[PDB]
Design a protein around this ligand. Sequence first.
Ligand SMILES: N=C(N)NCCC[C@H](NP(=O)(O)OC[C@H]1O[C@@H](n2cnc3c(N)ncnc32)[C@H](O)[C@@H]1O)C(=O)O
Length: 124
Amino acid sequence: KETAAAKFERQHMDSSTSAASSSNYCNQMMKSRNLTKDRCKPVNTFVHESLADVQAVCSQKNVACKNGQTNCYQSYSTMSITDCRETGSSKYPNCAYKTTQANKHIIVACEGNPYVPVHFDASV
Ligand SMILES: N=C(N)NCCC[C@H](NP(=O)(O)OC[C@H]1O[C@@H](n2cnc3c(N)ncnc32)[C@H](O)[C@@H]1O)C(=O)O
């Protein structure tokens, strides 16, 4: 059964420098990562850094999470990311996305032993 850490990897990790894809990065990735299965996940961030650099964020800048938890962490360096956000005409199961590429500081929530990212909180 998928661990919280595994799920963050499937949902958010795409280690590859930058978005690369055949047609439309978000439409393809949101499908392939199973984020269109039971509905159109409305917004999803992919991170294009190594797993090691992302995991490292759990010991970087401690910040409050959007939901009021205190177990979130902001990266010290900007990171390559892509934002996927569902278009207005998107309707499950015909999920369609707008692709926005960015280099920003990521904020992840981290949990467990070992203490690793389980949730993608914000980009700053
Ligand atoms: N709710 C926040 N802060 N973010 C949700 C949208 C951002 C989206 N992050 P995500 O898919 O990794 O996580 C969203 C889910 O995470 C739950 N969630 C919100 N705060 C959380 C937290 N502090 N820790 C674990 N899960 C949290 C939300 O209810 C959503 O179900 C992204 O990819 O950009």
